[PDB]
């Protein structure tokens, strides 16, 4: 994540000095970091107190949202907003057979 | 009419639990109090079926670690999940 930003500039610099016909090489615009143009992948009730035939429909619908990398409703995507790691938290009081 | 007064085999589902409870009273008096039997119900049939099924999922459960004869049926199917 952070290590890339270095390499990219230096690989530019090798090719400005080797080519004497290289002209107006770009700078990466600032707004792409200030405003999201790279990453786009980044009420809440306890599921254990709910009836059964609402718990099944609800946990299926919420986990389907959760898979993409962002919060669903009763399962949350834990914030890291970065590297190859991501963990999700389903509510701890879900019935043990369904939660496993 | 009042009925034809049930036999032992015809009596059941209440008289079975009753007959079990009386057998447990018999065992506890003939022991002296060095056994301590638990509740035969809780777990019932379906609760126990789900508890053993969780071990076939691949994680242990309430009576597992890594109606009084139900233990004898139980061990045979408990060993497979463990």
Q: What is the DSSP secondary-structure string of chain B?
A: -------TTT--SSHHHHHHHHHHHHHHHHH-SSS----SSSS-HHHHHHHHHHHHHTS--TT-----THHHHHHHHHHHH-
Which residues is A88 bridged to in the sheet? A77
CA dihedral A76, A81, A83, A87 (to 10 degrees): -10
Resolution (A): 8.7
Distance CA A10, CA B12 (A): 86
Q: Are B59 and A97 in contact (CB under 8 A)?
A: no
Instruction: Provide the shortest C-alpha distance from residue B62 to chain A (in Å).
Output: 10
Which secondary structure element, helix H or strand E, spans residue A4, and what is its range? helix A4-18
- Inter-chain Cβ pairs, chain A and chain B, closer than 8 A: 9
Q: Are B21 and B38 in contact (CB under 8 A)?
A: no
CB contacts of B54 in chain A (<8 Å) are 96-97, 100
* HEC per residue, A28-73: CCCHHHHCCCCCCCCCCCCHHHCCHHHHHHHHHHHHHHHCCCCCCC
The C-alpha R_g of chain B, in whole angstroms, comes to 17
Report the SS3 class of residue A89: strand
The coordinates were experimentally obtained by cryo-EM
Instruction: Provide the shortest C-alpha distance from residue A60 to chain B (in Å).
Output: 19
CB contacts of A94 in chain B (<8 Å) are none
CB contacts of A96 in chain B (<8 Å) are 54, 61
Which one, of B39, B37, B62, lies nearest residue B50 by Cα?
A: B62
């Amino acid at each position: 994540l952070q290590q890339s930003l270095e390499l990219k500039r230096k690989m530019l610099r090798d090719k400005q000095n080797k080519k004497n016909s290289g002209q107006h090489l770009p700078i990466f615009p600032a707004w792409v970091y200030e405003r999201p143009a790279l990453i786009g992948d980044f009420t809440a009730l306890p599921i254990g107190t709910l009836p059964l035939a609402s718990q099944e429909s609800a946990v299926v619908e919420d986990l389907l949202y959760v898979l993409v990398g962002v919060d669903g409703r009763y399962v949350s995507a834990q914030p890291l907003a970065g590297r190859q790691s991501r963990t999700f938290l389903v509510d701890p009081n879900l019935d043990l057979s369904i939660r496993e | 009419g009042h009925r034809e007064e049930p036999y032992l085999t015809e009596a059941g589902r209440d008289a079975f639990d009753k007959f079990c409870r009386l057998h447990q009273g018999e065992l506890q008096l003939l022991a002296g109090g060095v056994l301590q039997a638990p509740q035969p119900v809780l777990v019932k049939e379906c609760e126990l079926v789900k508890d053993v099924l969780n071990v076939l999922i691949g994680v242990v459960s309430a009576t597992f670690s890594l109606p009084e004869s139900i233990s004898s049926l139980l061990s045979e199917v408990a060993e497979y999940g463990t």
